[PDB]
Design a binder for this molecule. Structure first.
Ligand SMILES: Nc1ncnc2c1ncn2[C@@H]1O[C@H](COP(=O)(O)OP(=O)(O)O)[C@@H](O)[C@H]1O
Lengths: 103, 373, 191, 188, 191
């Protein structure tokens, strides 16, 4: 805070009307610009994650087949035998994490 | 602040009509006719000693500014920093005025050209190439200003006084004078621009002469009276002859930078006469004899093989060489302008080609009409 | 309750980057957009308001919708960097209003002129008699610095609606000191 | 406020309380949009994940022609199939494991084989590490071990100078407890 | 960098009917709509499209109307029923193309960066012309030349997947240009 007082000592008509506008006027115009850009993009993307979550809700629907994961691969990949005694493959697993799964 | 110009009213002639008009404009807080008025003062050719007397007022402009286009604001401070005439504090003053608008208006790119405009005179290598390079890193997404490339050439024009900037200057001298359009300044600077343009393609490596510049008006309309030897030696290149008289008379005319590269002159024309003697006969007998090269290029017999392997190496021809007959076969792929009177002969080739297609199509259709169906 | 299609026309030229109106001429015309969009909304929940610019291009950034929140969002980052082009601004507002999805609405245009316009007197009176053959009321409200009541502006307003027409006001402002109180005096209830 | 050093000091000490207050919440808005973009990334992964079909596991019995194969499902019948475009038909050998389309029924992707977990006993234990510094006093046999085992697989050029083959293998005979496994584990 | 575009035969087909939709009021002689796509590689794919209200004036040829709001919602519909598909560009007809196509393209490049346009030829359908597609690049023009736009061309083709050849082969039923030809078939290919 020494330079805060000390720059008010040296140049009394050179930056007291000037520096205390220029980096504050350019601050507040960019702050006025970027307080509304992010806020509008916040509210828009809450709506899109709402609509996607409603979309996943409809296509994630009972009844379910049960099965048992036999093994797990990555080239994330799983080989699944159903309790219909049928072995399927899927390259993409779905609404879990692969690391959270176990055979 | 109004009295600041009431006491600094002098050196602008017609003092009431421009200074009392001035204190109308910023006291109504307008900033465009004000900007046109201050642009009118600085564009005025005077000594303009009051740059320090106006930069306090220009700081007074930037006090209650809050609106003003930094494009024209930096366009007028580059004349002010031209008037300062002391490059040591001028760079520090420029970078302060550069950083005061880091906003979305790209005048920072022409600040960097204004850096090298004062730095290709002092400190000429270490960051001049960097302020060369940084501009086309940012010269992107927008050809609409075109003063961005205009001033980017202006540092490259000062970069012409380096060693290896002859063809790269020549490529950029077309880029500038293509992107700027109007003539907007007299012959007495433009004809020297054409003069250094003709020498830059003369010394340039990949260029042969790159014709239609002979068609391009900024040399033929501007040097049709003086330096006609350069238009003459561009005639001899685009007409490909040795023509030893006038292609020596350019060395009689041009004393610097031409005798030092006279070997490269004779090197270029002896591989430029090739792509016209193969242009003469239209591949009916393109098997050219070696003596015709030794006659036209007036080179000896033993050098024509290194001469044609050179033009094959550069890639302006894709022929081959036999030596049991010492004749040169020619399959040629480097085309150029063909001078509208020879579009006429090109039309007649196309019509003979046209009627041979149509006639013996009708012979086939009439012959096999019964089984075509 | 009345069915019309309001096409507000703002300026974002260079000549709005100055301050004869004390906060900002943009904020002066932005608050003018606030009071006209709330007026047409509260007069009828069945009308619709779309915006059109005129500087350097004419962009139809919001279409003629009864929504207003998108319009208020597009009022920001307007970037007043252009140059006024006005003869195409009516023509891009009229053929916008021939693409109306509700073709029972009336047609009314309001326009914000905060720049000196440079146009032939012949071009606008061809546009004025075009609107006479097309029945569109246009409200021209002058802002910014003001070459006030030109032969261009007055004869266009007159030939907009002659022989007991609407009364589309060629609204003039004091350049600076004074808010949109005169802007809500006559046209917002008696156009 | 033109030039009193007291009031122009207070000219920005009313401003700096504002201009940092408007800057404080904005980086918070930067953080909240950053977390929402991370959450939107997970949603779009699931929109990709929702559209997959699932495949049929089978094995190739033989190859008939350049495009006709004979495969067999794990529990079902035999079939005649083809490739997709570029599935490297030389790599499909009789006995490999493949994955079939559900409806089009042709081969999508081949798979390696990881059968009968008795032989799956090589991935749970360690190779060591033992690096000939733990083993004691048996080095004369250790050097004789390393020529016939280590030097073939590391260094075949020596066996091509004189001209000699052998990767063969040893027999370790000796009463139990001494070294009969560590020498195997050290060279492994 | 586009190798070639692949025209699915529902899109052209869904242009010709929409030209016939407005043909009862037909005075525009051009139809502009939105071209959905599926970008896979340097080769492009198109399999769906729709239309959009558009008008154009012969005088000054620079007052034109793509509808953004109609382009927002109906693409939001086709995204909802099929999330595989997205926009890749737009189309028009009338092979003597209006020079306004710089302005149409540079608007809706804010929807797709490498936007692309395909010209179909509804009425000229006779000699050798299925369609035509352009690509948008902008140099200055050349070395010592002024600025320009210069639409460039990418070659095109008509594609085919299963369960549209089923729709094709059931709809020909007359001559079909039958499978692998006889003597008469090859000679006509030479004719
Ligand atoms: N020479 C040696 N150096 C290091 N460790 C040894 C040595 N001899 C025996 N041991 C120890 O004795 C244990 C038994 O060795 P092991 O190889 O299992 O016996 P066997 O050879 O009968 O299988 C090992 O854990 C090893 O640590």
């Amino acid at each position: 805070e020494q330079d805060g007082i000390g720059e008010e000592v040296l140049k009394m008509s050179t930056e007291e009307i000037i520096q205390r506008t220029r980096l504050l006027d350019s601050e507040i115009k960019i702050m006025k610009s970027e307080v509304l850009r992010v806020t509008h993009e916040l509210q828009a993307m809450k709506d899109k994650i709402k609509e996607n979550s409603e979309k996943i809700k409809v296509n994630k629907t009972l009844p379910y087949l049960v099965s048992n994961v036999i093994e797990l691969l990555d080239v994330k990949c799983a080989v699944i035998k159903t309790s219909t005694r049928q072995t399927y493959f899927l390259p993409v697993i779905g609404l879990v994490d692969a690391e959270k799964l176990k055979p | 602040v109004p009295g600041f110009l009431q006491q600094s009213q002098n050196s602008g002639p017609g003092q009431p009509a421009v200074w009392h008009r001035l204190e109308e404009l910023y006291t109504k807080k307008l900033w465009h006719q004000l900007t046109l008025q201050v642009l009118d003062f600085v564009q005025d050719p005077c000594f303009a000693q009051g740059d320090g007397l106006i930069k306090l007022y220009e700081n007074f402009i930037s006090e209650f500014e809050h609106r003003v286009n930094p494009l024209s604001l930096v366009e007028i401070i580059l004349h002010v920093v031209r008037q300062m005439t002391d490059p040591n504090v001028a760079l520090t003053f420029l970078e302060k005025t550069r950083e005061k608008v880091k906003s979305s208006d790209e005048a920072v790119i022409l600040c960097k050209t204004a850096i090298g405009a004062l730095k290709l005179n002092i400190g000429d290598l270490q960051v001049t190439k960097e302020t060369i390079e940084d501009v086309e890193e940012m010269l992107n997404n927008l050809p609409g200003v075109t003063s961005v490339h205009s001033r980017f050439y202006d540092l490259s024009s000062k970069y012409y006084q380096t060693i290896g900037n002859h063809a790269s200057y020549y490529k950029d001298a077309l880029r500038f004078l293509g992107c700027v359009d109007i003539k907007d300044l007299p012959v007495s600077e433009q004809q020297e621009r054409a003069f250094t343009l003709g020498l830059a393609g003369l010394l340039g490596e990949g260029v042969f002469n790159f014709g239609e510049l002979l068609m391009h008006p900024v040399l033929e309309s501007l040097r049709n009276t003086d330096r006609q030897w350069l238009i003459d030696t561009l005639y001899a290149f685009n007409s490909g002859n040795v023509e030893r008289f006038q292609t020596l008379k350019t060395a009689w005319g041009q004393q610097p930078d031409l005798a030092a590269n006279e070997a490269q002159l004779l090197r270029k024309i002896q591989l430029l006469c090739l792509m016209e003697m193969t242009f003469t006969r239209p591949a009916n007998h393109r098997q050219l004899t070696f003596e015709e090269i030794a006659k036209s290029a007036k080179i000896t017999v033993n050098e024509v093989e290194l001469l044609v392997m050179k033009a094959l190496s550069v890639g302006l021809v894709k022929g081959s060489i036999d030596e049991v007959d010492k004749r040169v076969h020619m399959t040629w792929v480097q085309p150029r302008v063909l001078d509208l009177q020879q579009i006429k002969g090109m039309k007649d080739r196309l019509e003979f080609w046209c009627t041979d297609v149509k006639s013996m199509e009708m012979l086939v259709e009439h012959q096999a009409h019964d089984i075509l169906t | 309750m009345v069915l019309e299609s309001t096409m507000v026309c703002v300026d974002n030229s260079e000549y709005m980057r100055n301050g004869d109106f004390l906060p900002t001429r943009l904020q002066a015309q932005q608050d003018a957009v606030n009071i006209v969009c709330h007026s047409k909304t509260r007069s009828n929940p069945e009308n619709n308001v779309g915006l059109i610019t005129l500087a350097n291009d004419c962009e139809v950034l919001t279409t003629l919708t009864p929504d207003t929140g998108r319009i208020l969002s597009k009022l920001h980052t307007v970037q007043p960097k252009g140059k006024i082009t006005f003869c195409t601004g009516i023509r891009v507002a009229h053929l916008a209003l021939k693409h109306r999805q509700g073709k029972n609405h009336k047609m009314r245009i309001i326009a914000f002129v905060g720049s000196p316009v440079e146009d032939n007197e012949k071009d606008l009176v061809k546009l004025a008699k075009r609107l006479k053959k097309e029945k569109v009321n246009v409200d021209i409200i002058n802002f910014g610095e003001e070459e006030v009541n030109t032969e261009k502006l007055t004869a266009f307003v007159n030939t907009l609606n002659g022989k007991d027409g609407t009364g589309s006001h060629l609204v003039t402002v004091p350049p600076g000191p004074s808010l949109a109180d005169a802007l809500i005096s006559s046209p917002i209830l008696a156009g | 406020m033109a030039d009193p050093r007291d009031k122009a000091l207070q000219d920005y000490r009313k401003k700096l309380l504002e201009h940092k207050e408007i800057d404080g919440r904005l980086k918070e808005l930067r953080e909240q949009l950053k977390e929402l973009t991370k959450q939107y990334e997970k949603s779009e992964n699931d929109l990709k994940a929702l559209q997959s079909v699932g495949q049929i596991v089978g094995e190739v019995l033989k190859q008939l022609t350049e495009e006709k194969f004979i495969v067999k499902a794990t529990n079902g019948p035999r079939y005649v199939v083809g490739c997709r475009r570029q599935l490297d038909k030389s790599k499909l050998k009789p006995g490999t494991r493949v994955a079939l389309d559900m409806t089009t029924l042709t081969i999508m992707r081949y798979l390696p084989r990881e059968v009968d977990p008795l032989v799956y006993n090589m991935s749970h234990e360690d190779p060591g590490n033992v690096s000939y510094s733990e083993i004691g006093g048996l080095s004369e046999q250790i050097r004789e071990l390393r020529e016939v085992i280590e030097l073939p697989l590391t260094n075949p050029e020596l066996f091509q100078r004189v001209g000699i083959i052998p990767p063969k293998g040893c027999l370790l005979y000796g009463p139990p407890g001494t070294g009969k496994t560590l020498l195997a584990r050290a060279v492994a | 960098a586009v190798q070639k575009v692949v025209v699915h035969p529902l899109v052209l087909l869904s242009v010709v009917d929409h030209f016939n939709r407005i043909g009862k009021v037909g005075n525009q002689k051009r139809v502009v709509g939105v071209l959905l796509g599926s970008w896979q590689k340097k080769v492009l794919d198109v399999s769906n499209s729709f239309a959009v209200p558009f008008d154009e004036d012969d005088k000054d040829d620079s007052v034109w109307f793509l509808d953004h709001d109609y382009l927002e919602n109906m693409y939001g519909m086709f995204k909802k029923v099929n999330a595989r598909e997205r926009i890749v560009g737009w189309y028009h007809t009338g092979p003597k193309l209006h020079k306004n196509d710089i302005a149409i393209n540079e608007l809706m490049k804010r929807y797709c960066p490498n936007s692309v346009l395909v010209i179909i030829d509804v009425k000229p359908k006779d000699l050798g012309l299925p369609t035509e597609a352009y690509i948008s690049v902008e140099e200055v023009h050349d070395d010592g030349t002024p600025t320009s736009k210069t639409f460039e061309h990418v070659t095109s083709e008509i594609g085919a997947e299963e369960a549209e050849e089923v729709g094709v082969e059931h709809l020909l039923r007359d001559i079909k240009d039958t499978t692998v030809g006889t003597l008469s078939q090859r000679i006509t290919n030479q004719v």
